Structures are given as structure tokens and as C-alpha cells.
Amino acid sequence: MRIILLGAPGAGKGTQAQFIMEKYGIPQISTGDMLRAAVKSGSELGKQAKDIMDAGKLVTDELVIALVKERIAQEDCRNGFLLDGFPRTIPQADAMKEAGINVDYVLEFDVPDELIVDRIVGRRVHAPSGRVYHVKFNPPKVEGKDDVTGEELTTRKDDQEETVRKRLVEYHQMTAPLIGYYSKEAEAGNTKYAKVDGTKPVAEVRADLEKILG
Amino acid sequence: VSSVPTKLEVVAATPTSLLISWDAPAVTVFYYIITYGETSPVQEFTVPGSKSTATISGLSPGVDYTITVYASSGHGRDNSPISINYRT
Ligand SMILES: Nc1ncnc2c1ncn2[C@@H]1O[C@H](COP(=O)(O)OP(=O)(O)OP(=O)(O)OP(=O)(O)OP(=O)(O)OC[C@H]2O[C@@H](n3cnc4c(N)ncnc43)[C@H](O)[C@@H]2O)[C@@H](O)[C@H]1O
Ligand SMILES: [Mg+2]
């Protein structure tokens, strides 16, 4: 089972990725998490990527393609996988098609920009795993602590409204063309496409995706 | 038939814009594809599979339009649509 999550940064892809992971037994592959690990490494390229991420811009195509190809060749990705935030440009999608990486579903999250900017205010993360909560719309069981480890939750410093809006400008310029790209693939029978209303509460977006999937 | 929407109607209008509504088909809808053009290039857009309404704008007043709604099962225009003709 192979799935691509498509949508604006902050539309809720990582939140719903966890349920899909838990139910089909496939790993989540988040290029953002992979890049954050590269930053925490401390290479010059990790530093270069952190400077690009801090400005709300995309890292170079060829770098992220190479990181994904390495990640999907691992033993835990045999039975399938969920791509979260990749591909992110047309050249990234073309690299997948040219390499023969087919997928079963492409799932588009429909959320308006101003609602995204609103939601990120309350986001909290468990940094080591990257798990994501919201103080109102998806709170942890006991305040400020990750649910299955008990360690503290934190807030990313790259979640300033200013950086959020820069990611959204990047998204509409660079990433939204993938909607038309995969709509054409779906019309050719190369994957199934679906569009979900991501403005609903967390539990209802999950219920709509359960209806689509199988 | 189970994959074709029914009862497509214009439910609100201005001289240049309108809102359409339909009864969803029986199948699970992955997304809808909506097309419209003068009854000239045809325009197309999508809405989530959970919706049963859509807005169309930029219409010329007093002109006849054909509006078509496809419910997709995941493979683009893979089910037959329902259409309506409407003069603004
Ligand atoms: N392929 C690539 N190529 C080049 N560069 C790349 C790249 N991939 C990554 N990068 C670089 O890495 C950077 C970061 O990438 P990435 O890590 O992917 O972050 P992002 O693009 O900013 O997307 P987010 O993780 O913030 O949003 P999300 O959709 O997962 O929503 P979430 O579940 O967290 O939810 C957001 C909040 O809302 C809450 N929420 C979720 N769902 C709901 C709901 N239904 N209702 C109410 N609240 C909800 C959540 O609890 C949470 O608080 C990029 O900017 C780029 O620089
Ligand atoms: Mg995410």
C-alpha cells in the first residue's frame, strides 16, 4: 500500500498520517522530518538546509529525491509506505515516475490559507518523534506531554506566522501544480485520486479518509 | 444508477455567478469534477467528495450555459455525469 498526501503546509497531513500508519502497517516518510534530522546532524549541508527552511523556502529537488529513494529502499518500506510532503514539485514527481515508483492513492487536503495560519498558533510537537498535537483541536491526554512516552511537548520556532505565510506562498507557486499533475495520472489509471475537506474537525477528516481508503 | 448524481439544480444566483446543488450518488465519491461552458473553451474545477454544492462565477448575463457534474471513483471522469442548462 503506497499513498501520497498532498496539501498546503499545515493542512493536517502529519496528523492524518498517524492513523493511516496505525491501520495499514506502513511507515510514514516525511521529508520535513528527514531534513530536520539532517539539520540536527550538523553537516554544512544540514546548515544550508536549516537556513532554507527558516526562510520558508523549499530545499533543492535533487537532494530530497535522493533522500527519499534511500528511505524507500529500506526493509521497513517493503510492504508499502506513506509519503508525507513529498513529492513537492513537478520535477520531484517526475523523478518518481521515471524511477518506476507507482502509488495507489494520492490524497489532496483542501484547507484555506487563513485557517491554516490560525491553526498553527496552537500546534505542539514531541520533537524526537515529530508527533503533532493542538491545544484545542487535538490535545494530548495530559497537558504538555507526549501520549505514549510521557516526555514533554514543545513548539517549533519556525512556526512564526511570518514563516507560515512564506511556506504558503512557496506552496502555491511550487507545489499546487501537483494537483493537476496527479489528476492527469488518475485519469490515465495510474493511481486513484481523492479530495477531502480538511476544514472539518480531526475526527471527521479521519472518517472521510476511512471512507475513501481500503 | 449508483454512480451518477441526481437532481442537479441551480439554487442561488446573481447576474454573473450561481450556486449549484445535487443529490450525491450512492457510491463513495473520491472527488467531483465540474465543467461548464456556453451551450467556447470549457472550464473545469473540483470539489471534495463530501460536498454536494459548488459555486461558478464569471458568467455572462443572459447567456445559456451547460454545467456538468462527474462523481469520480478515483480515476478522473470514470463515471457518467449529470448536466443542466441554465440561462443567466
Ligand atoms: N519534498 C520537499 N522538497 C523540498 N523541501 C522540502 C520538502 N519537504 C520538506 N521540505 C522543507 O522542510 C520544510 C518543512 O516541511 P514539513 O515538515 O513537511 O512541514 P510543512 O511543509 O510546514 O507542513 P506541516 O508539518 O506544518 O503541516 P501538516 O500538513 O503536516 O499539518 P499538521 O498535521 O502538522 O497540523 C497542523 C496543525 O493543525 C492541527 N490540526 C491538524 N488537523 C486538524 C483539523 N482537522 N482540525 C483542526 N486542527 C487540525 C494539528 O494538531 C497541528 O497543530 C519545508 O518547508 C521545506 O523547507
Ligand atoms: Mg507535517
Do A108 and A183 meet the contact criterion of CB atoms below 8 Å apart? no
Say if B43 is an interface residue toward chain A (CB within 8 Å). Answer: no
Experimental method, per PDB record:
X-ray
CB A13 within 8 A of CB A7: yes
Give the number of C-alpha atoms closer than 13 A to the C-alpha of residue A70, restricted to the C-beta side. 8
CB contact at 8 A, B76 and A187: yes
Question: What cell was used for B49?
Answer: 467528495
Strands A2-7 and A105-110: parallel
3 state SS for chain A: CEEEEEECCCCCHHHHHHHHHHHHCCCEEEHHHHHHHHHHHCCHHHHHHHHHHHCCCCCCHHHHHHHHHHHHCCHHHCCCEEEECCCCCHHHHHHHHHCCCCCCEEEEEECCHHHHHHHHCCEEEECCCCEEEECCCECCCCCCECCCCCCECECCHHHCHHHHHHHHHHHHHHHCHHHHHHHHHHHCCCCEEEEEECCCCHHHHHHHHHHHCC
CB of A162 within 8 Å of a chain B CB? The answer is no
Q: How distant is the Cα of A24 from the closest Cα of chain B, in angstroms?
A: 19
Nearest CA in chain A to B74: A192
Give residue limits of the domains in chain A.
Answer: 1-214
Distance, C-alpha B22 to centroid of its chain: 8
Domains of chain B: 6-87 (2.60.40.10)
Resolution limit in angstroms? Answer: 1.9
Q: Which residues of A are catalytic?
A: 13, 88, 123, 156, 167
Just give the CATH number of A1-214.
3.40.50.300
Distance between CA atoms of residues A165 and A169, nearest Å = 6
